[PDB]
Amino acid sequence: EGLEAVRKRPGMYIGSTDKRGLHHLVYEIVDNSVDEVLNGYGNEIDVTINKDGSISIEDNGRGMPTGIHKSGKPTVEVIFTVLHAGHGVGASVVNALSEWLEVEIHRDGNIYHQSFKNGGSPSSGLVKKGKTKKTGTKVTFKPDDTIFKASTSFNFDVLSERLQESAFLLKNLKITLNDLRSGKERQEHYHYEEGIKEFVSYVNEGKEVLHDVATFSGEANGIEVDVAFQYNDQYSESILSFVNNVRTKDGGTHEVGFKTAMTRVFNDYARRINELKTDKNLDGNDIREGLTAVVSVRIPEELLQFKSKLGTSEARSAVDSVVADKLPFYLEEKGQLSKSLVKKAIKAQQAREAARKAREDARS
Numbered sequence: 001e002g003l004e005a006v007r008k009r010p011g012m013y014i015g016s017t018d019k020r021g022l023h024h025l026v027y028e029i030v031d032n033s034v035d036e037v038l039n040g041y042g043n044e045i046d047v048t049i050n051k052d053g054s055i056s057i058e059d060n061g062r063g064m065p066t067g068i069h070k071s072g073k074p075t076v077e078v079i080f081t082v083l084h085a086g087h088g089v090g091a092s093v094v095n096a097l098s099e100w101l102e103v104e105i106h107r108d109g110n111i112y113h114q115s116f117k118n119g120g121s122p123s124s125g126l127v128k129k130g131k132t133k134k135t136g137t138k139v140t141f142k143p144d145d146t147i148f149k150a151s152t153s154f155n156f157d158v159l160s161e162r163l164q165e166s167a168f169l170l171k172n173l174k175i176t177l178n179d180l181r182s183g184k185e186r187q188e189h190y191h192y193e194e195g196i197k198e199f200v201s202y203v204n205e206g207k208e209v210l211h212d213v214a215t216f217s218g219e220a221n222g223i224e225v226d227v228a229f230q231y232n233d234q235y236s237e238s239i240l241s242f243v244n245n246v247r248t249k250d251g252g253t254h255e256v257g258f259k260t261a262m263t264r265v266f267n268d269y270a271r272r273i274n275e276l277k278t279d280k281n282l283d284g285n286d287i288r289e290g291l292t293a294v295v296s297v298r299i300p301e302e303l304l305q306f307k308s309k310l311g312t313s314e315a316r317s318a319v320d321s322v323v324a325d326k327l328p329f330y331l332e333e334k335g336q337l338s339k340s341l342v343k344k345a346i347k348a349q350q351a352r353e354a355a356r357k358a359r360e361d362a363r364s
């Protein structure tokens with residue numbers, strides 16, 4: 001009954017039926033809690049790997065609606081049983097691929113509980129039972145053995161990497177990952193008050209840093225932007241791009257917008273402090289040498305287009321504008337540092353030119 005289509009072709013919805021597909025089920029539920037925190041409701045997400053094979057995902061958000069949907073069915077049943085109701089395949093796909101799923105909604109001092117079993121078949125109605133001092137939703141589900149053949153066991157380190165990433169992107173979000181399994185009991189907490197500023201320092205661990213993380217945010221078009229960067233004394237570039245708390249591994253327009261404004265502001269500043277003469281412009285390449293940067297954007301549903309590579313042409317204009325508006329003032333106020341970063345980029349340009357001449361001489 002709709003969920004049976006998900007059960008016959010799971011790959012078409014979660015990619016695979018291996019560790020990757022198993023862990024994506026966890027991410028679908030985590031995302032709903034993340035969305036809620038974005039909207040200003042809640043600040044805590046608890047992920048618990050249970051002894052029985054299940055996984056619990058709890059938040060302190062508003063809690064799911066308890067009432068009858070536009071249709072004649074309880075909203076909880078609509079969410080978990082109606083395909084793609086509300087990647088974003090929905091809680092209903094998690095239910096379809098679960099042996100059992102339990103919902104717990106904390107609303108106005110009361111706990112509302114609903115159970116699902118086998119293909120995502122309601123094994124109870126929404127029952128009001130228990131008193132509470134908190135607001136939020138808790139989803140516990142045990143993956144189906146027949147679906148995730150030899151792949152139902154949750155991996156702590158896989159989840160930790162993704163949960164730490166979510167905490168870095170949403171400052172003041174506290175994520176706790178708990179493993180209760182015998183012989184594997186562990187706990188980690190991810191809470192970064194300085195957000196993507198803390199992400200940059202993390203990516204630069206084990207490398208010497210040239211200055212403290214430079215951060216700047218703003219809004220251009222309908223896109224919110226967060227940019228953090230810090231140079232190391234090494235030569236590699238490490239540009240991490242994110243769209244709506246989710247990584248875009250192949251970059252896109254938001255990444256292009258950051259890179260173009262960075263080259264433009266650096267060149268303009270270099271000529272202003274007379275390091276470059278009337279003498280060619282520094283390439284992006286020279287400027288980005290040893291640069292670790294995090295580009296995090298928030299785009300409305302209407303504007304979005306592509307995933308892994310953003311296509312939203314307006315996001316180029318958005319990042320370009322925030323960087324071009326904020327970076328000149330950073331460089332002007334950090335006079336000695338910025339003069340040093342200009343010289344550094346000139347030396348990278350000179351090194352590259354000498355590599356080019358040696359290559360040409362070896363050819364001719």
Ligand SMILES: C=C1CC[C@@H](O[C@H]2C[C@@](O)([C@H](C)NC(=O)c3[nH]c(C)c(Cl)c3Cl)[C@H](O)[C@@H](C)O2)[C@@H]2C=C[C@H](C)[C@H](C(=O)C3=C(O)[C@H](C(C)C)N([C@@H]4O[C@@H](C)[C@@H](OC(N)=O)[C@@H](OC(C)=O)[C@H]4OC)C3=O)[C@@H]12
Pocket residue numbers: 029030032033035036057058059061062063064065069070075078079082083084085086091137138139
């Ligand atoms: C079913 C519901 C009731 C819940 C509501 O979501 C909550 C979610 C919310 O509780 C919050 C984010 N949740 C949590 O905190 C949370 N925490 C945890 C641990 C979990 Cl899990 C959650 Cl959740 C939030 O606080 C409030 C504001 O919204 C949903 C959000 C948006 C819609 C208005 C949606 C709805 O009423 C829909 C419908 O009436 C129809 C269906 C039921 C007839 N529908 C459609 O459902 C299919 C046919 C689609 O199909 C696809 N995509 O293939 C479309 O259909 C189409 C044609 O696009 C989709 O239409 C847009 C809907 O999505 C809503």
